[PDB]
């Protein structure tokens, strides 16, 4: 026993992208999500279950909290998709009155249901327990400010284990007009608690499924956020599968973390289809990884590659794993203080992703997040230098100067990651 981690959904997208993970863990693991058994004994594989499930006398179950201030996206959630002997009613913390895109109600009423998820976790976490992984977007409420507030709640009380955040930042056109301040709230949140803050946004994710998957619509949520689900699997696939060299949470998150910092990752995976998956090397796969129509942050380019950790699953040659580097380090670029045989860090997993032949998924700690970062920045200036929607936030607890503080601080990231690039 050891390595086991909860995930804790926070408000609608934390909890529609939940479906998406869970769905293609179960799959990986040949579990039936609709019966909660193996679908055969004959191919279980041999491969270590516990990391996200639970297994119980009748059944498998997710190791997950399904968290929200208002019912309805997971209510429907689990109707539609035929979830409720898996995402059952003891797995979830729901309030009614929601958090009205506002940060800092969903942190003041989040306090309220702390007591229940704390009693939640400590009934069935087990000792063992590696961490937590909090899955929310950043330009709502609940996620946003509930969000918050477990990274930090879940830090002090559970010292020693990981706290890693997979955060949806917003759309290259808000589709939430208080998402500034929701999301430099959220990320001066992150940078004090969390030890690894994974990103992605919609821009991007939607490039990908049009241009990659080449989808003709996009009709529901689940048509894009099985990427995220797609990266959280596989960057945790040498936890569960066999392979010649794994990784742990806390494994990937020392490679990356230059300065205490530097913990905002852009998340890429290669190539996205099986039929691709089947006519590449893993030269391309790599090449693809790293460049920016992969990249899950809408980024102008490459940046400057602090480190980087890759993934490599299924029927990969290890040779040409090893023997691509020194091409990596010579046409990617690396922010400069970056010695020219480092930067790496290598995960290798029998297992591939299910139907693919292979496939690299990359998490990159890149001086791009400046610019990321720095275009929140003005759109949160444009709001509050005229003092515009600040009136609910002030009304729940976040006081004008506490927003201009996080902003401040926020301010200091981005000035971090702009001195490595040079
Ligand atoms: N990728 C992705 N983005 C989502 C999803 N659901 C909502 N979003 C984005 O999340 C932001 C809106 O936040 P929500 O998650 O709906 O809000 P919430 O966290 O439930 O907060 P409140 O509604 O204010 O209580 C917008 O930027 C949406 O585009 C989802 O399922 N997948
Ligand atoms: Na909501
Ligand atoms: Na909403």
Known sequence: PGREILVLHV?????????????????????????????????????YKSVFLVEAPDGFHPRALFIDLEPLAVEFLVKEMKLGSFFSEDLMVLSYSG???????????????????????????????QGFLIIHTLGGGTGSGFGSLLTETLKKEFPGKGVLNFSVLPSEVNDVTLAPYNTVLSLNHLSRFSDLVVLFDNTALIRIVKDQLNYPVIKQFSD???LIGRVMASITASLRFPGPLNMDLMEMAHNLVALPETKFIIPSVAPLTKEE??????????????????????????????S????????????????????????????????????????????????????????SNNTIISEVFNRVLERFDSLFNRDWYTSDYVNAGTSKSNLKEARDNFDRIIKIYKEIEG
């Open 11 to 47: 408000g609608q997208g934390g909890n529609q992208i939940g479906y998406n993970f869970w769905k293609t863990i179960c799959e990986e693991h040949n579990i039936d999500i609709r019966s909660n058994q193996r679908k055969s004994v004959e191919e279980d594989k041999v491969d």
């Open 99 to 129: 958090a009205h895109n506002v940060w800092s109600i969903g942190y003041q009423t989040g306090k309220k249901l702390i007591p229940v998820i704390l009693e939640k976790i400590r009934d069935t976490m087990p000792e063992t327990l």
């Open 224 to 226: 894009l956020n099985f």
């Open 277 to 306: 998956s089947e006519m590449s090397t893993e030269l391309d796969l790599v090449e693809r990884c790293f460049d920016p129509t992969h990249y899950m942050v809408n980024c102008s380019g490459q940046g400057k590659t602090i």
């Open 308 to 363: 980087s950790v890759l993934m490599f699953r299924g029927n990969i040659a290890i040779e040409n794993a090893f023997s691509i580097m020194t091409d990596i380090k010579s046409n990617v670029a690396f922010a400069p203080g970056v010695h020219p045989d480092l930067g790496l860090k290598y995960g290798i997993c029998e297992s591939a992703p299910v139907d693919f032949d292979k496939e690299v998924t990359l998490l």
